[PDB]
Ligand binder design. Structure first.
Ligand SMILES: Nc1ncnc2c1ncn2[C@@H]1O[C@H](COP(=O)(O)OP(=O)(O)O)[C@@H](O)[C@H]1O
Ligand SMILES: CC(C)n1c(=O)cc(N[C@@H](C)c2ccccc2)[nH]c1=O
Ligand SMILES: [Mg+2]
Lengths: 900, 34
């Protein structure tokens, strides 16, 4: 149409044309004959029925195959009007393939976005499509979901509208497999709010750049994606009462610290490493005094280090610019690159065993003094601390000699813990900017907390990342199917609860519970005598045959040294248990970190200042905070779908996408959006809002009950009486009635308020153009006085005029009166405003401080109970390991005595 | 809730572990008698 031109050149990638709709109507089609049939290489395919054979069907396919099909495996083609629809809820015949071919015909035309009722499903284009042009964002401004073509920008507008209407916090929950676009879609949602506030900036830019700067440290090319991030992130975007952008808050859950020193074949270390090595800037290369060739540094160099798709010279330029805009000082940016460099050098330190003491001494002293020079330690006390760490025994410290293998492992642990703390500090500095100190009333939380991933080799953070997403999809299950459906029964609607069966809470409890995998790894890593093999024994014993998601591995590809596999929501992920306990505890040589605390490098001290609380437990508590923070928000979900393994753009593999829609439970979200009631409004808020539909049903001044008035008004609309229901405090609408009431409200308002707006445009234009007339008048007296000014200074008499009048009485008295009135007016206003503010604000402050101390006492009660539980568990687990050893020897002794 | 369930499962496991050592030390004494 004429209006779609606002979408510009992106329009062919957003909406099937009207000429295509008429063309579709020209298509030979028959509701009685056009059906889908299932197949191997394509999950579903278009076909035409040729015969009906009782409880059997035969049909022939678009690509010429013929197959016998059963009724439950055959399902209607929707008529050409409905094919490729914008919103899958509007489908006439609802089934999995109509979802697939709505996707495949849209994505076949590079229309990537579709809704599945209330929310969006996105199938990934590896091509950079124009659907994200910043002038396409403006086309979503206020364009409600029933009018707009599907896009992520529609969800962002919907969240901003529900924010302003319900006066409640919102959220946008971007989800999917790895490589689907969660990081880019997050960057687009943030771009949405940034450019929306940009037409109506420091925070606006900072929220966008807060992604790539954290990416370059956070992210590494993996086998599954060239730009897969390795840390969970939760953002809150805070808006003021006037709806403008106010603040933002970046919370990050766990960096994949293990990657810093170890990469499998075909995967990189974190991008910051190679982009500093592969460098356009020699100064970065020599200030680290690192070699330009990546290969000689053992820890980063293993795996694969050059990639088909990344201009690391520019990705370094990009990370540099991201810290420039985020306002990290040059000394901070350089120090964190120095720390990355030192973690590179730290693997190059060579240690040799003494001929008789089995103690590590450095032969490769050049690498150790290079490292110490960067971290601001000394070569000798660094080497002495590493080889001879100090441990406390009573009040005095004792010195222990380290093995060459265990000093290598300790240097790895120092590299990891310096990297991970440097990342969390960088986040804390981002959260220390990103604050324009403006008063806050609403926030919209955008989440990208992991891609699901399978590599051939998965480790501690591949458990963390897959689990952390797992919880976000179970949050989808709970919000759409539990929280939404319970509300209907609570309101007393004649509604029957339907079980969608989509539940995975057993597998989150499998990880999260005090008997889960992460609970085991935290209870085990306290014992200094624990080892990965017994961790494997206890881990298998606690879950095998006790969890539906825990199963023994097959190890068909060999490698059965120590494996387990966990069926996270989107499929298999196999895990390698090797090294996990050291990774969970992350024990640092206390002399070496005490020397770090003592460093000349202000960052390294700040990182280590103020060095039971394992990495598992800290991550866990952050993610539990996440869900508690998120339940106080109104969520919209975004399902990002990967189309194909091989990065082939525009190609769309049906088995991978359909399996993703299966694991994301999107078809159920269609069912519940069509069958259920997508929108409810409080009786007071709606009666007042849309009474405009029939003011004779709700006269002003006269007493009206909101429930009884709502009953009369809706009976007066003459709409199908089955499309609404009455609750105790909320009105209930179907999606057909909601949309019809929404549009009738918009039109009734349009007829009244456009007249009112015409008057408002009248006053706005009149008053502003009057101001332009006043500023014209001031311009006129300016140019007149400038003409007077030239006329005066070229006039020879000016010598009297200029000098005498400052001396004369007018400058003595008129200026005095001007200052007197200025001071008295400012006196009056400043006095009243400051007294008002203080009197109100002191009583508010004391009320909040009292509530702060009450909750503080609550925290004190918590810390008391947790300390009791800690001492109880510590004594129970220490006595278990002692007695368990005693029973092992008792049994072996009795076996010996029976053998006698 | 985490700390209480942790203590509760440690006590239950200790109960079963006590039953284990009860049977073991009994059988060791029986072997010493025989
Ligand atoms: N809608 C899209 N448009 C353009 N490129 C995309 C889109 N979705 C994914 N990609 C590409 O796929 C890769 C992964 O995107 P990303 O947002 O990082 O997802 P993930 O974080 O799951 O890897 C990137 O190279 C990105 O450019
Ligand atoms: C309970 C929940 C699903 N819900 C609703 O059911 C309706 C909401 N808002 C109504 C008031 C609205 C309609 C149209 C534009 C803005 C707001 N919000 C909501 O959050
Ligand atoms: Mg990502």
């Amino acid at each position: 149409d004429s209006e779609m031109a606002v979408f510009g050149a992106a329009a062919p990638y957003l909406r099937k044309s009207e000429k295509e709709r008429l063309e579709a109507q020209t298509r030979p089609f028959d509701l009685k004959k056009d059906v889908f049939v299932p197949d191997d290489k394509q999950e579903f395919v278009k076909a035409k029925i040729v015969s009906r054979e009782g409880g059997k069907v035969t049909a022939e396919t678009e690509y010429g195959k013929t197959v016998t099909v059963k009724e439950d495996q055959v399902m209607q083609q929707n008529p050409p009007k409905f094919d490729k629809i914008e919103d899958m809820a509007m489908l006439t015949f609802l089934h999995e393939p109509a979802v697939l071919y709505n996707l495949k015909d849209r994505y076949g035309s590079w229309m990537i976005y579709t809704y599945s009722g209330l929310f969006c499903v996105t199938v990934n284009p590896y091509k950079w499509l124009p659907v994200y042009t910043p002038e396409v964002v403006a086309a979503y401004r206020g364009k409600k979901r029933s009018e707009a073509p599907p896009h992520i920008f529609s969800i962002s507008d919907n969240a901003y509208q529900y924010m302003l209407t319900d006066r409640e916090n919102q959220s946008i929950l971007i989800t999917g497999e790895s490589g689907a676009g969660k990081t880019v879609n997050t960057k687009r949602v943030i771009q949405y709010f940034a450019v929306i506030a940009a037409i109506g900036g420091t925070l606006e830019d900072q929220i966008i750049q807060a992604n790539p700067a954290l990416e370059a440290f956070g992210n590494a090319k993996t086998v599954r994606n060239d730009n897969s991030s390795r840390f969970g992130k939760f953002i809150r975007i805070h808006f003021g009462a006037t709806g403008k952008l106010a603040s933002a808050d970046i919370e990050t859950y766990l960096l994949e610290k293990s990657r810093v020193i170890f990469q499998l074949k075909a995967e990189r270390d974190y991008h910051i490493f190679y982009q500093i090595l592969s460098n356009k800037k020699p100064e970065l290369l020599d200030m680290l005094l690192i070699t330009n060739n990546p290969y000689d540094y053992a820890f980063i160099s293993q795996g694969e280090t050059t990639v088909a798709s990344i201009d690391d010279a520019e990705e370094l330029m990009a990370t540099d610019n991201a810290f420039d805009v985020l306002g990290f000082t040059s000394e901070e940016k350089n120090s964190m690159y120095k720390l990355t460099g030192a973690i590179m050098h730290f693997g190059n330190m060579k240690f040799k065993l003494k001929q008789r003491e089995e103690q590590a001494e450095p032969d490769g002293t050049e690498e150790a003094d290079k490292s110490a020079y960067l971290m601001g330690l000394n070569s000798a006390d660094l080497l002495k601390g590493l080889c001879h760490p100090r441990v406390k025994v009573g009040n005095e410290y004792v010195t222990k000699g380290q093995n060459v293998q265990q000093v290598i492992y300790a240097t790895g642990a120092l590299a990891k813990a310096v990297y991970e703390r440097m990342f969390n500090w960088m986040v804390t500095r981002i959260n220390a900017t990103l604050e324009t100190k403006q008063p806050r009333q609403y926030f919209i939380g955008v989440l990208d907390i992991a891609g699901f991933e399978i590599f051939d080799f998965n480790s501690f953070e591949q458990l963390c990342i897959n689990f952390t997403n797992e919880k976000l999809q179970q949050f989808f299950n709970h919000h759409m199917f539990v929280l939404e459906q319970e509300e209907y029964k609570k309101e007393g609607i004649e509604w029957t609860f339907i079980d969608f069966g989509m539940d995975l809470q057993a597998c989150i409890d499998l990880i999260e519970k005090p008997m889960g995998i992460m609970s085991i790894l935290e209870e085990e890593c306290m014992f200094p005598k624990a080892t990965d093999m017994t961790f494997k024994a206890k881990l298998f014993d606690n879950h095998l045959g006790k969890s539906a998601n825990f199963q023994k591995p097959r190890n068909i590809k060999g490698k059965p040294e120590a494996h387990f596999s966990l069926i996270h929501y989107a499929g298999i992920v196999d895990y390698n248990i090797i090294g996990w306990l050291q990774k969970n505890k992350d024990p640092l040589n206390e002399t070496v970190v005490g020397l770090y605390q003592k460093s000349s490098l202000k960052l390294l001290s700040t990182l280590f200042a103020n060095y039971f609380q394992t990495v598992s437990a800290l991550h866990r508590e952050n993610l539990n905070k996440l869900m508690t923070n998120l339940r106080s928000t109104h969520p919209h979900f975004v399902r990002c779908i990967i189309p194909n393994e091989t990065k082939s753009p525009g190609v769309m593999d049906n088995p991978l996408v359909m399996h993703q829609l299966r694991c994301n439970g999107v078809l159920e979200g269609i069912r519940i959006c069509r069958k259920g009631f997508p929108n409810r409004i409080l009786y007071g808020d709606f009666r007042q809002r849309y009474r405009i539909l029939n003011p004779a049903a709700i006269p002003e001044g006269q007493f009206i009950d909101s429930r009884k008035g709502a009953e009369k008004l809706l009976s007066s609309l003459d709409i199908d009486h089955n499309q609404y229901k009455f609750g105790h405090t909320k009105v209930f609408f179907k999606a057909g009635l909601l949309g019809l009431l929404e549009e009738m409200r918009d039109e009734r308002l349009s007829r009244i308020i456009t007249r009112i707006q015409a008057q408002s445009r009248g006053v706005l234009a009149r008053m502003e153009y009057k101001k332009l007339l006043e500023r014209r008048d001031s311009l006129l007296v300016i140019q007149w006085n400038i003409r007077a000014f030239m006329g005066v200074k070229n006039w020879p008499w000016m010598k009297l005029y200029f000098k005498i009048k400052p001396l004369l009485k007018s400058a003595e008295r008129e200026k005095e009166m001007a200052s007197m009135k200025e001071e008295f007016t400012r006196l009056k206003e400043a006095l009243e405003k400051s007294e008002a503010r203080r009197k109100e604000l002191e009583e508010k402050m004391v009320s909040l401080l009292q509530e702060k101390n009450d909750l503080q006492l609550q925290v004190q009660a918590e810390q008391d109970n947790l300390a009791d539980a800690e001492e109880r568990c510590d004594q129970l687990i220490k006595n278990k390991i002692q007695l368990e050893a005693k029973v092992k020897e008792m049994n072996e002794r009795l076996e010996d005595e029976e053998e006698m």
